Design a protein around this ligand. Sequence first.
Ligand SMILES: CC(C)[C@H](NS(=O)(=O)CCc1ccccc1)P(=O)(O)C[C@H](C(=O)O)c1cccc(CN)c1
Ligand SMILES: [Zn+2]
Length: 304
Amino acid sequence: GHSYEKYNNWETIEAWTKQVTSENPDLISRTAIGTTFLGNNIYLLKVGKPGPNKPAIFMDCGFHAREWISHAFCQWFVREAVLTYGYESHMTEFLNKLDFYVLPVLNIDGYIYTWTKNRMWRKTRSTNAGTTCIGTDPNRNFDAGWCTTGASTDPCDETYCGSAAESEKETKALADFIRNNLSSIKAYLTIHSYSQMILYPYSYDYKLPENNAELNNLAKAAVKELATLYGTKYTYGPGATTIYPAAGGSDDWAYDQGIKYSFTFELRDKGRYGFILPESQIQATCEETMLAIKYVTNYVLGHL
Ligand SMILES: CC(C)[C@H](NS(=O)(=O)CCc1ccccc1)P(=O)(O)C[C@H](C(=O)O)c1cccc(CN)c1
Ligand SMILES: [Zn+2]
């Protein structure tokens, strides 16, 4: 049984992806872009008014298994899109002019693991050689200054960068989809928790992005928009200095491919509850995050 105000297990999220597609068959289509190490289907939703060669915004949730408010947000976002499309000017224009690619859970194997054995698991669940330790950090597994800084070469560590860039089937699947659609994808948004930040490149080096000016200004505006609702305070900036260095991230990789609007969101809270954010806070967190996402969508649309 699914709720937008509770955390749902994978079986339920998987059924939800099929359910929401069947109820909105002319607004939403569903695809599997690959399978996890354990063989689960990695689903991607395409949301928008059907039309030839539209630009798109790409958003994923659930890179990291324990960051449950991330998964909850992609679901919240899709419902908001559907509920307001057709009679809210902004969202109606949004889905008229572009598509959203929503990947509700990337790291499905880990998510199941956090529901069944260890709530605090982070990584994938693939096997490693030379050690009994399991898993690779998906946000260390992309071809962006891979394993050069901010990652561990130790497979027992939480930031293990993997056997090689895109060693993980999940990261390969995501990377492969985006490569094929680099033409249409105009923005990349990846949702994490916690610590209340908006990050943009770079994380694999203290080097600043070409349009560092444009991105810093957009993030500043986004966090101001988000705080309007509940006063929630976000910080923002290039990844390496705003949080810490972390090579192999999907946002840096997205930006180096030609996606000049690439952001990582870190949602509530700032550590009081951390990854175990109370379900009573799901709605508030999602509502305010929507304001930032919509602000970014409006901008990308305008400068498209
Ligand atoms: C709480 C939140 C800040 C997460 N950090 S974490 O779970 O403590 C990372 C694991 C860890 C734990 C202890 C010591 C070293 C690493 P995150 O996992 O969502 C941060 C994210 C990452 O580490 O992949 C991150 C950090 C820096 C830059 C970017 C943008 N690519 C993204
Ligand atoms: Zn994370």
